[PDB]
Amino acid sequence: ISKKQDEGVVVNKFRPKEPYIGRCLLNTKITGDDAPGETWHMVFSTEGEIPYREGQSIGVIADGVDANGKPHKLRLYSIASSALGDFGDSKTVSLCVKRLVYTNDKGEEVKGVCSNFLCDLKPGADVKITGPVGKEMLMPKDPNATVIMLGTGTGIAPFRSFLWKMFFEKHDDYKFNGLAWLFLGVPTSSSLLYKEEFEKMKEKAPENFRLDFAVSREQTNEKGEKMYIQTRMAQYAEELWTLLKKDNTFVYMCGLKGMEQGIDDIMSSLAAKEGIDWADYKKQLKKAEQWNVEVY
């Protein structure tokens, strides 16, 4: 249950009326040109003014007006940097933004206003920021907890955040000796966000970090089925169910809305064999702070 690291957690220090105005320090495409879409990694200056914590989001207000002549509402984006930031100086915030450009199939092509606003940012530009937002995805207090992270696409953001503190940073007050298991689902290799970082974490802490990739369009299971996050989880169902019934096991899930049912499908088959209903069981896990979901 380790009731998350919520001690002194600040929520909405900046609101839409008077947001923080940060500056884009860097903006780089991190997907290969052949990927089904582009995701960019960006760093904003905060001057230390945004007291965020791992697992939180910040709101961004795009420039311009909507079709009604009214300023754009804020869209939330999960912070991909740890509290210390990519520069390790506590003065920046980083985002992992997927450019939304869709025609669905054919017809009128429309671009998501805020995501496109973000991905086109140039170093030196100002950006209206609000927050921090969120308490659901805060890390567990227990440094020996079993943390299972299930993410898709940009859902990797808060988990990169967790792992920097866990394996790239040194905190006297936080020395993680538990099990961190990351499951990331993407369509192509060119879409494996921060792969190089995660493999570097694997070298450093081989006994504490377990990394499993699921590339749907390049991997299949024995039966010839595409490797979606849940089909990868399925090859560890036995272990995941065992771990799932321990008091210091927390599962975090972040990414696209679709991913949830797929995971529910797998969990149900496992729960049924052991003679318990997954809906009831999941309810209890949520209540015990051990099943935390942030899907959009």
Ligand SMILES: Cc1cc2nc3c(=O)[nH]c(=O)nc-3n(C[C@H](O)[C@H](O)[C@@H](O)COP(=O)(O)OP(=O)(O)OC[C@H]3O[C@@H](n4cnc5c(N)ncnc54)[C@H](O)[C@@H]3O)c2cc1C
């Ligand atoms: C807690 C939280 C965390 C988030 N973290 C991230 C993150 O880390 N990275 C990230 O990139 N995004 C993240 N998001 C999503 C983000 O907030 C956005 O919704 C976003 O970037 C799209 O906002 P937008 O302003 O581009 O465009 P809008 O101008 O708001 O476009 C929105 C519309 O796109 C539509 N849409 C998309 N595809 C189609 C389609 N084929 N047909 C019809 N409608 C379609 C829906 O109508 C939707 O309402 C997060 C959201 C939440 C709630």
